[PDB]
Amino acid sequence: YERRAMELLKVSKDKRALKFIKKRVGTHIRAKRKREELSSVLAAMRKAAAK
Amino acid sequence: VSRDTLYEAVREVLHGNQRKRRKFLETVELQISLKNYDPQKDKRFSGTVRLKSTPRPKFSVCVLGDQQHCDEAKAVDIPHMDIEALKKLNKNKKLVKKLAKKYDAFLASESLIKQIPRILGPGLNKAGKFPSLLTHNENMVAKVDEVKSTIKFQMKKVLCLAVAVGHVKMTDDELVYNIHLAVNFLVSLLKKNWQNVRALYIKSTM
Amino acid sequence: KVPPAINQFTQVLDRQTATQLLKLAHKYRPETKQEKKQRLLARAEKKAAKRPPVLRAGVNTVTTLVENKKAQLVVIAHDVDPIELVVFLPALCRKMGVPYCILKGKARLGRLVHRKTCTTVAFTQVNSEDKGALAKLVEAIRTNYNDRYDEIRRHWGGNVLGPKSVARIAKLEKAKAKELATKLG
Amino acid sequence: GAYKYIQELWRKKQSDVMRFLLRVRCWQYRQLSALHRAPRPTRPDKARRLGYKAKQGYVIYRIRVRRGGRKRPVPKGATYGKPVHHGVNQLKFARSLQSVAEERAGRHCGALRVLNSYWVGEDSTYKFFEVILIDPFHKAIRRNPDTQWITKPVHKHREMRGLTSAGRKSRGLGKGHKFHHTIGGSRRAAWRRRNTLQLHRYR
RNA sequence: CACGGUGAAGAGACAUGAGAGGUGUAGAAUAAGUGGGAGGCCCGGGCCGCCGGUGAAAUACCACUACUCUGAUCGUUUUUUCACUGACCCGGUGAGGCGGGGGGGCGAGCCGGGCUCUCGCUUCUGGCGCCAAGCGCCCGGCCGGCCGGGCGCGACCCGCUCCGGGGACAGUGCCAGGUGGG
RNA sequence: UAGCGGCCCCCGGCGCGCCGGGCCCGGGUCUUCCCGGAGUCGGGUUGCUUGGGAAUGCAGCCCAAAGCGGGUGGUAAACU
RNA sequence: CGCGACCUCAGAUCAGACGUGGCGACCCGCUGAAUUUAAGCAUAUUAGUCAGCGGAGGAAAAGAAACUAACCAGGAUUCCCUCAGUAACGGCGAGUGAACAGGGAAGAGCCCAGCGCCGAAUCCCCGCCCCGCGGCGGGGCGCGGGAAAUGUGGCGUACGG
Ligand SMILES: [Mg+2]
Ligand SMILES: [Mg+2]
Ligand SMILES: [Mg+2]
Ligand SMILES: [Mg+2]
Ligand SMILES: [Mg+2]
Ligand SMILES: [Mg+2]
Ligand SMILES: [Mg+2]
Ligand SMILES: [Mg+2]
Ligand SMILES: [Mg+2]
Ligand SMILES: [Mg+2]
Ligand SMILES: [Mg+2]
Ligand SMILES: [Mg+2]
Ligand SMILES: [Mg+2]
Ligand SMILES: [Mg+2]
Ligand SMILES: [Mg+2]
Ligand SMILES: [Mg+2]
Ligand SMILES: [Mg+2]
Ligand SMILES: [Mg+2]
Ligand SMILES: [Mg+2]
Ligand SMILES: [Mg+2]
Ligand SMILES: [Mg+2]
Ligand SMILES: [Mg+2]
Ligand SMILES: [Mg+2]
Ligand SMILES: [Mg+2]
Ligand SMILES: [Mg+2]
User: Fold this and answer.
1) CA-nearest residue of chain D to C1?
2) How far apart are CA C29 and CA C114, in angstroms?
3) Does C132 lie at the interface with D, CB-CB under 8 angstroms?
4) What angle is formed at CA C40 by the lines to CA C39 and CA C41, rounded to 5 degrees?
5) Measured between alpha carbons, how far is D33 from D10 in angstroms, rounded to an integer?
6) Which of residues 102-121 of D touch strand F (CB under 7 A)?
7) Distance in angstroms (rounded) separating the CA atoms of residues D197 and C114
8) DSSP-assigned beta bridge partners for residue D98
9) To 10 degrees, the CA torsion angle through A28, A30, A31, A34?
10) How far apart are CA C100 and CA C80, in angstroms?
11) Cα separation of D64 and D125, whole Å?
């Protein structure tokens, strides 16, 4: 589900990605935290890709 | 946006200066691109970026002002022009558009934006002329150098803009401060966050 | 389909590298209870009238002195009972630059120390005679594991069928191949 | 140490390495009997977290338990009463399947005391739990001052009175406003103390 | 929903990213809109323009994106079909010759020889059939003779599931609707 | 029976003394390091339970964590 | 082929121990009704009660906060008085029904894993000698055997180290 959520965020369906993460992990605060660290690791891959 | 890959981009164009060695005047720019905002739809963002260095060497400026904007303007070497001189300009819509198209951006005093929509309101925004007011402090020395390069991020009939920032002769950390100002002002000005972008080409002009 | 973090333990040192490593390891063995009791007696008959370098054993000791950078070579057995005791350990050694090798036999690796089994051993220091020997071992070992880790990390194991099914597919695909040769005649 | 790496790697159960190992091992433990001796803990750091020490006296007995609820064992699904007690199918057992594993391990090896237990794998039909048992008459346990609470006769069959971890989790015990029904030591103690009549001498 | 996987096609979604057409004229055409621009490129000279000219935004110089179409390969998932087996299941057996590779007897077409297929020794009768003959190579005891053993062919070799049959479906666990005077 | 009444055994508890062995141990000030229990929490659903009422507790099933985090703060939910 | 490690798994009337069963007033874990009341009865009530099953001890359980609170804050658990037949639950009907604060009885705290350092510094068993020998323990000697590096012991645990 974490791979599916970064796949949603790659296509930038961020609201549906947050809803799917909420359906997976439960509480909205944990969902926001999960989506934030998936954005962080996806940004890490994108900032690795340019070099 | 983050700053590490922007550092990588400015390093690769600081060493891409040797790829070019410019002679059509040394200046660079960047682009900004957006993904899914409708070009014909509402929530149109329209703002000004204050920039502190002005990394654009020949910024083309004139003043349109009343008395007490004469002697200090002649001592700072910016051409001055009066209300009856604007009547002289208003005598045809032939030469005034050409002078305003040769010049880039104007600035004007308090009571002459009252007289700029006589019959020439729609004539002057045809070339994008909203002249910016001065103040009662009456000190335009380097305040014109501050008012210039305030880049207008404006939405119009397609979804992209370009911003005139940079020369590699200037210092790198101030240049990335300029691009930081541009990108965080547009990310705040957008209807959503920095997800709306595609990429940033802070490249050379030529 | 075995994941690569487990499949990396199937690729090991060969016979020559294993014997050259064991020959070095036989000289840095930790002393047994007999040659520690008599070592106590030998210390006492001269002090009551420095520690030589040894092998560090076990996942906790080896893990702790790998993350402290203090290891110079680490040997990990291929066949521990839960593999999760050491499945992180090649990744840890690669990030902290420690030369790691995977050796066949926790029985051999716990016959180095005087026990039954051990998961891993580590050379922290060696004597000045064996510094060139550890240099030649490390230059042989690092070309297989530490420099090949980005290829090792994506190499999946298993996924090979039974010989009866491989033979059936082989007969079917060679029938298809010879029929495809008969297509053009 | 290595144990934090092992612990954080056991926490990522949906990863590929863990899914492979849980699948392979769960097949292995499904191939064996429902109650069998394990030569060592499968989860060493989890076992020592719950109280295992690798010394003589600690044994591991691995248990297979059947998943699901508790179907009410009435003949042909007929509970002869009011319709609130007509439930047969969707009922649940008050204790967890882990505590069921501990009580099966203890009732087999009645000469050993249940210390704790932990989860090692599952599929749709079984849950697998490793139970740590201890021999209170071995001299290592009998002569370690730090471990001899279990030697005392009050710790006979902790798993059958719910004094283990998975046993005490099912009793509703705890501190605070969520656990007002176990003031005393139990639901029993609270109900007895509240549903009594203190008839004093002098009223 | 879960246990519950492997591969190949069909059908989508068109993401990374390749190529590409723009007419109320005016004007160097056919400027999709915009930021800004005083002197490249080509190698002192040359080139349209930025300016003239001038229209609904004036085009040099470098720019971003688009609207839509198309192709490409890893869109990555979803879906259908066809297969696989290792989960699971069923059957048989004292889990007794399974699968390949040989080697041998026939056939097919060529010059004693290479290649494809095939077969493997029991049907004339209400007998009998195990506990090895034979061959070869070693070893021992008593003065080449006697006595007494061992190994190997006979009974080919290599393997990773006993052999088949199904198979990610039966099934089981938990929910959901229907049916339910048993 | 009464009694700080008696006598004789026994079993302790309580003090001092000897031999052998063990233990050869702290507080304050400053500096440098380190620190946590996962098919668990939590979510949904189901069933039981509770005074706990948009769910008090427990359990099955499914999902399934994080670390300036988590739990609680008796009305579901978002922001602080 | 053969030998030896290790792992996993057997066998033994192998050496030494331990469990079973009873009692069950009190205690712990499950399982768990219906009579009854509601002037009928199905939710409710009876009742988490009886019956059933398992496990103990001289007490058990509980217990040193993933607590109460919102205060000028308290401070493990257990028990008594009061809170209080109250908040609250309830075909909001019948009925059910706590908790905190307060006063007392009692009063006590602590330990691991984990993180780290110390030549595994740790444990068990057999042989000999001396003692004590009816709770099988103390000292010393064993080039005596195992366990344990898939982590024993010493320090150390959120009050910080
Ligand atoms: Mg119950
Ligand atoms: Mg107790
Ligand atoms: Mg819980
Ligand atoms: Mg019926
Ligand atoms: Mg009827
Ligand atoms: Mg008397
Ligand atoms: Mg109830
Ligand atoms: Mg709040
Ligand atoms: Mg509230
Ligand atoms: Mg015996
Ligand atoms: Mg009635
Ligand atoms: Mg009546
Ligand atoms: Mg009646
Ligand atoms: Mg009830
Ligand atoms: Mg009873
Ligand atoms: Mg009993
Ligand atoms: Mg008793
Ligand atoms: Mg307790
Ligand atoms: Mg209290
Ligand atoms: Mg009152
Ligand atoms: Mg009640
Ligand atoms: Mg109180
Ligand atoms: Mg330790
Ligand atoms: Mg300790
Ligand atoms: Mg604490």
Assistant:
1) D20
2) 8
3) no
4) 90
5) 25
6) 118-119
7) 70
8) none
9) 160
10) 16
11) 10
